[PDB]
């Protein structure tokens, strides 16, 4: 429960946005 | 606060706010949790909002979401292993590009292949082209 929160609020967003801002 | 941090925070918010109205409801939280194989009750979801619901309005806006994430960051090993298993679908201990693509497709993020491979390269520390459990730990902390 809190695991999915930690995942979707700590590591994954950094990668998704660091790849998305390169356009 | 850097320009880099803001884009990351924005993408994380937009992951939950799947209808894009600028608020996160209990229903959106539940939907995102279930797409990751979790099953939260209505009470758990309301408690999740009310743990950050500064204005008592029953939904999560942007700064309350920031508070939720900062609290969660300060928070565990069982949880990290659980999320790893969320991504390591076949349990071989390495998150592949295909697995990350599958997870993105489950979350609704329409990302190109080259972009997913970029994400893998960005998170990959040893350079084998996959994410092992320790690299995942590094990503979280
Ligand atoms: Ca919404
Ligand atoms: Ca609120
Ligand atoms: Ca795997
Ligand atoms: Ca690796």
Residue numbers in the entry:
A (entry chain C): 2 to 24
B (entry chain A): 4 to 78, 81 to 146
Verbatim from the authors:
We solved the crystal structures of both hCaM and pfCaM complexed to melittin and refined them to 2.45 Å and 2.20 Å resolution, respectively. The asymmetric unit of the hCaM–melittin complex contains a single entity while that of the pfCaM–melittin complexes contains four. While the structure of the hCaM–melittin complex shows more similarity with pfCaM/A complexes, it is still significantly different from either of the two pfCaM–melittin binding modes. Interestingly, while the overall conformation of the hCaM–melittin complex is more similar to the pfCaM/A complex, the interactions between hCaM and melittin represent a transition between the two pfCaM complexes. Leu6 is the sole anchoring residue in the N-terminal hydrophobic pocket, like in the pfCaM/C complex, while Leu13 and Leu16 contact the interior of the C-terminal hydrophobic pocket, as found also in the pfCaM/A complex. In the pfCaM–melittin complexes, most of these side chains could be seen in electron density maps and form salt bridges with acidic side chains, while in the hCaM structure all basic side chains are disordered. In the hCaM–melittin complex, beside Leu6, Leu9 could be also observed to contact the interior of the N-terminal hydrophobic pocket during simulations. The only differing residues that contribute to the intermolecular contacts between CaM and melittin are Met71 and Met76 of hCaM and corresponding Leu residues of pfCaM.
Calmodulin (CaM) is a Ca2+ sensor protein found in all eukaryotic cells that regulates a large number of target proteins in a Ca2+ concentration-dependent manner. The protein consists of two homologous domains (also called the N-terminal and C-terminal lobes), containing two Ca2+-binding EF-hand structures each, connected by a flexible central linker. Melittin, a major component of bee venom, is a 26-residue lytic peptide, with the amino acid sequence GIGAVLKVLTTGLPALISWIKRKRQQ. One of the several proteins that induce helical conversion in melittin upon complex formation is CaM, which binds melittin in the presence of Ca2+ with a Kd in the low nanomolar range (∼3–60 nM) and forms a complex with 1:1 stoichiometry.
